[PDB]
Scaffold this motif. Sequence first.
Motif, PDB file in Angstrom:
ATOM      1  N   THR A   1     -15.382  -4.468  -3.868  1.00 46.38           N
ATOM      2  CA  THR A   1     -13.969  -3.762  -3.658  1.00 46.38           C
ATOM      3  C   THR A   1     -13.531  -4.011  -2.351  1.00 46.38           C
ATOM      4  O   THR A   1     -14.217  -3.574  -1.396  1.00 46.38           O
TER       5      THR A   1
ATOM      6  N   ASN B   1       0.751  -1.305  -0.197  1.00 54.59           N
ATOM      7  CA  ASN B   1       0.064   0.087  -0.133  1.00 54.59           C
ATOM      8  C   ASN B   1       1.026   1.327  -0.020  1.00 54.59           C
ATOM      9  O   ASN B   1       0.669   2.457  -0.673  1.00 54.59           O
TER      10      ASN B   1
ATOM     11  N   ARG C   1     -11.903   6.445   1.320  1.00 59.24           N
ATOM     12  CA  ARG C   1     -11.424   5.093   2.265  1.00 59.24           C
ATOM     13  C   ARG C   1     -12.669   4.944   3.275  1.00 59.24           C
ATOM     14  O   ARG C   1     -13.197   3.717   3.698  1.00 59.24           O
TER      15      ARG C   1
ATOM     16  N   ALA D   1      -5.489   2.633  -8.663  1.00 59.80           N
ATOM     17  CA  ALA D   1      -4.509   1.471  -8.688  1.00 59.80           C
ATOM     18  C   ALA D   1      -4.830   0.508  -7.925  1.00 59.80           C
ATOM     19  O   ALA D   1      -5.254   0.651  -6.737  1.00 59.80           O
ATOM     20  N   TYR D   2      -4.694  -0.772  -8.566  1.00 58.88           N
ATOM     21  CA  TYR D   2      -5.031  -2.002  -7.855  1.00 58.88           C
ATOM     22  C   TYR D   2      -3.904  -2.845  -7.809  1.00 58.88           C
ATOM     23  O   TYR D   2      -2.928  -2.703  -8.817  1.00 58.88           O
ATOM     24  N   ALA D   3      -3.679  -3.406  -6.744  1.00 56.92           N
ATOM     25  CA  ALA D   3      -2.262  -4.645  -6.558  1.00 56.92           C
ATOM     26  C   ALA D   3      -2.830  -6.012  -6.452  1.00 56.92           C
ATOM     27  O   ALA D   3      -4.135  -6.117  -5.632  1.00 56.92           O
ATOM     28  N   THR D   4      -2.122  -6.857  -6.880  1.00 53.24           N
ATOM     29  CA  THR D   4      -2.586  -8.175  -6.887  1.00 53.24           C
ATOM     30  C   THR D   4      -1.119  -9.168  -6.135  1.00 53.24           C
ATOM     31  O   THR D   4      -0.310  -8.896  -6.785  1.00 53.24           O
TER      32      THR D   4
ATOM     33  N   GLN E   1      -8.674 -11.876  -4.785  1.00 53.41           N
ATOM     34  CA  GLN E   1      -7.509 -11.626  -4.075  1.00 53.41           C
ATOM     35  C   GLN E   1      -6.997 -10.239  -4.580  1.00 53.41           C
ATOM     36  O   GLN E   1      -5.698  -9.716  -4.214  1.00 53.41           O
ATOM     37  N   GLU E   2      -7.564  -9.342  -5.090  1.00 51.57           N
ATOM     38  CA  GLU E   2      -7.405  -8.165  -5.734  1.00 51.57           C
ATOM     39  C   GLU E   2      -7.680  -7.115  -4.498  1.00 51.57           C
ATOM     40  O   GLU E   2      -8.679  -7.111  -4.298  1.00 51.57           O
ATOM     41  N   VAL E   3      -6.751  -6.066  -4.311  1.00 52.59           N
ATOM     42  CA  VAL E   3      -7.127  -5.014  -3.398  1.00 52.59           C
ATOM     43  C   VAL E   3      -6.842  -3.701  -4.137  1.00 52.59           C
ATOM     44  O   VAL E   3      -6.099  -3.519  -5.180  1.00 52.59           O
ATOM     45  N   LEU E   4      -7.204  -2.624  -3.203  1.00 53.14           N
ATOM     46  CA  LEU E   4      -7.289  -1.168  -3.960  1.00 53.14           C
ATOM     47  C   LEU E   4      -6.453  -0.665  -2.833  1.00 53.14           C
ATOM     48  O   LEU E   4      -6.225  -0.565  -1.536  1.00 53.14           O
ATOM     49  N   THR E   5      -5.282   0.395  -3.563  1.00 57.34           N
ATOM     50  CA  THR E   5      -4.314   1.014  -2.727  1.00 57.34           C
ATOM     51  C   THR E   5      -4.719   2.407  -2.564  1.00 57.34           C
ATOM     52  O   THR E   5      -5.701   2.857  -3.195  1.00 57.34           O
ATOM     53  N   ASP E   6      -3.813   3.122  -1.960  1.00 60.54           N
ATOM     54  CA  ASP E   6      -4.227   4.540  -1.935  1.00 60.54           C
ATOM     55  C   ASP E   6      -3.170   5.489  -2.552  1.00 60.54           C
ATOM     56  O   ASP E   6      -3.134   6.637  -2.634  1.00 60.54           O
ATOM     57  N   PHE E   7      -2.454   4.739  -3.730  1.00 64.55           N
ATOM     58  CA  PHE E   7      -1.585   5.420  -4.709  1.00 64.55           C
ATOM     59  C   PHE E   7      -2.351   6.480  -5.559  1.00 64.55           C
ATOM     60  O   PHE E   7      -3.311   6.125  -6.161  1.00 64.55           O
TER      61      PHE E   7
ATOM     62  N   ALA F   1      -6.863  -2.073   0.875  1.00 61.32           N
ATOM     63  CA  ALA F   1      -5.432  -2.828   1.617  1.00 61.32           C
ATOM     64  C   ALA F   1      -5.400  -2.787   2.956  1.00 61.32           C
ATOM     65  O   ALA F   1      -5.318  -3.616   3.652  1.00 61.32           O
ATOM     66  N   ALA F   2      -5.156  -1.424   3.377  1.00 62.76           N
ATOM     67  CA  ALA F   2      -4.808  -1.385   5.028  1.00 62.76           C
ATOM     68  C   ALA F   2      -6.227  -0.718   5.657  1.00 62.76           C
ATOM     69  O   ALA F   2      -6.388   0.254   5.408  1.00 62.76           O
TER      70      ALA F   2
END
Lengths: 100, 885
Positions: B878, A3, B227, A60-63, B246-252, B881-882
């Motif tokens: 959706t 993250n 958020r 942006a998504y991360a796997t 297993q896909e997550v969303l970041t804060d970038f 992540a954190a």
Amino acid sequence: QANMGQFRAALRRIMDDDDWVRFGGVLRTVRVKFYDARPPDDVLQGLPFSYDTNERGGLAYATIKYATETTIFYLIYNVEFSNTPDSLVLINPTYTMTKV
Amino acid sequence: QRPERIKTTPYLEGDVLSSDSGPLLSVFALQEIMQKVRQVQADYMTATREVDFTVPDVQKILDDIKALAAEQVYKIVKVPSISFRHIVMQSRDRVLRVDTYYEEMSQVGDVITEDEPEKFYSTIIKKVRFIRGKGSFILHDIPTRDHRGMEVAEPEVLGVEFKNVLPVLTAEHRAMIQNALDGSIIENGNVATRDVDVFIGACSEPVYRIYNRLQGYIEAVQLQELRNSIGWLERLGHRKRITYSQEVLTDFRRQDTIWVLALQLPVNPQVVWDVPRSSIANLIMNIATCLPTGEYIAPNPRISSITLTQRITTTGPFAILTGSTPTAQQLNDVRKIYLALMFPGQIILDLKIDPGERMDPAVRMVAGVVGHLLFTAGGRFTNLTQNMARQLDIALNDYLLYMYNTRVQVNYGPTGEPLDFQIGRNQYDCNVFRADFATGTGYNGWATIDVEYREPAPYVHAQRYIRYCGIDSRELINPTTYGIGMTYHCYNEMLRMLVAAGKDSEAAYFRSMLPFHMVRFARINQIINEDLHSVFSLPDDMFNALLPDLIAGAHQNADPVVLDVSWISLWFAFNRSFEPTHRNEMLEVAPLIESVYASELSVMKVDMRHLSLMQRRFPDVLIQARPSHFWKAVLNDSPEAVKAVMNLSHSHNFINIRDMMRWVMLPSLQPSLKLALEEEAWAAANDFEDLMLTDQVYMHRDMLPEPRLDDIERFRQEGFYYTNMLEAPPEIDRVVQYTYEIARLQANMGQFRAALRRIMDDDDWVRFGGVLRTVRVKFYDARPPDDVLQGLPFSYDTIKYATETTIFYLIYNVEFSNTPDSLVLINPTYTMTKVFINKRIVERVRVGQILAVLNRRFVAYKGKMRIMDITQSLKMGTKLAAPTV
């Protein structure tokens, strides 16, 4: 850590300090292989995890995925009478990143 | 994938009978609701207003509601619109500057009249909407150039147009204007790696207000609100046990992207439930958007009969009934029964009576037996009226007292009420099976707790957990008893009473059939506590208050929909179970729909609340008004999908004045970007002077001037002009105050003209106050026609008080051939009407101060940036992540 964009940097720092990393506690199947020459780069330089990024709608998504299979390889060195005494010495070493 | 659908024994496996889904069941429920009242009004003589009861397409309405979320309230333009223009006279150093906002504003709505309040309200709403639409914009990629090592904005982005005045100037004024133009440098423009450009321009104040508010909202709402919304969605999905990828969303956040967000997930449910007469619409919407897709499974055929040899087979007591198939009407009634079961207090069953059928008398008795242990009439909620309960009790009495075997003894009681006897050798009392709504003595919920509270819910209005006949949903996964030990109080008492009545085979059949019944109610409990949790569910207060109002017969605002069924339908519904297979298609999209609906309702409510005070503020203009007038006016300028949702049950033909006046007073709002912009525009529109209608209209006899033309170039240079514009009103003394009623009374007596003439000859002033009038602006270079030179604020047709008024600016032009006494006349010409406005519209300004309107600060995003709308990504599936607190 992904993250904040500190995953690969953390792994590199941990490698630089000559430490060990364990990924979870899931049981993994084991394969045994034998080789007589330089093994393919999939076995040596391969990694036990997958990390991907994507963009959707400005977000942006991360796997992150963990591998489920590991392998054991036994490498046998074969030499001939035409070899120079320091033939196998390389100016830069070759790295492997798997221990079981 | 989910452990409650794993079957290890063939007891729960049976053939598929049919299937139903949410979109079909909602339309079915609406059709059966409307057909009933249509039939009742057709059969008997009714006297009422003519209204047509139709059924809409719910799927199309939902699709339109979803499509409403993609609209945008702002615009992205390169340059701002022009807000100032100039008029050039024969003078060489003076011009007439005009603010274009008022000139465009004066021609937005229809002329205000004294007999059409609805058009007045529509004009006000249209003016407010025009102000909001013009105000909201974001600048992007403005043109600039270079000058002496500085970045200078082009004259194009400046909100002043001065091309037509350049040739008439001189060298000094042209040099001064060029120097002023070159001085508008881009602040902090000499550095790189920027994100905004800051400069100075000109704009009108009302547009500037909405511009500043929009910029502040864009700067304010950011990743934190996103958020929070995703966290609330995560909690809701945790309650609903939806699977996650297993896909997550970041804060970038990319360096070249700016997010906007016009909606929020924690919707205040009260705004949904304050709509007058909306219970049916909310129930239909909930069925449409939350019900899953499943099929009906019959019990295993081996429960009734088993084979010992090929010519030896056990026989069941109800072999005739089980060897039967339903028709279409009976299937519809079974669907009605399940629909009433899956919604506790909002749908109530009744009995259908028609002489067009010939049924075996035993069917009614078996149905009366089944209904006691199938339905619930407990002390907290009910599934049926009192009449149906009485009929079921009578049927049970008839079944008990009819004996096809050797008779057993029976002792009757004193009263003649049904089921008032003791039957059997051991004298089992049957008084407990008569219906009593205070405690629910004869039905499910006899001695069990069926409504409890476990944890705080994501939706604050609904917190209850329903447990039909004491079964918890975890019993399918981790049971707490053997197959024998599965039971509850009412069913066991039913079995013991059946045994005491000499009917043993029926008791054995029911004892065999019990676990299927228990599993069916377990599945119903899981369905009602898992998937049906939404905003459109009934709040706790109404759910608690439903039963006492029905008992006392008092008026209630959440009257349940009542449907009727047949006798054999009870048995048919008893011999089926509803097992879901697929989740609803729009399960992960609904909260966005609810948020959009709430935001639109809040905007409508604030518009009504702001318009409600018009009669108090101006009494003489709105004599013939009602709340319904501005009700229709507000509804006429709203999205049609929201109106379609609000009018599922044709409610709008039945709201009276008191209901809508009550709804307007209710203090519940759902904040959003559109609401903020509308509220800011309404605040800017409180001063009626900005809307270009006023009541400061005067009449005073004045002379068109005849200046002395002794020096032609001097007269040209001074820039002489005339107007009926008042820079300051006269004192309170020496003016008279007229009123609509006084003027009407004096006009009806043939005394108005004489009174006005007498006032005029005394050199005084008169005010026709109390009535707002539309005001227009005109410019003339020659003598204007007598239509506007000697106009009047009233018209003869009795008089009309609200007549539009035109402010006119007359420009004088002279030639070198004019003699110094060429403009004087023996008999003077007169002009009557004058108008006072405290704002500043048309001004005589020297050429050195043309660019003196540059006093506004503008911030514009650069050309490398992008602006995106992220409101479409707020989905239930959706996961971030954190996690947040």
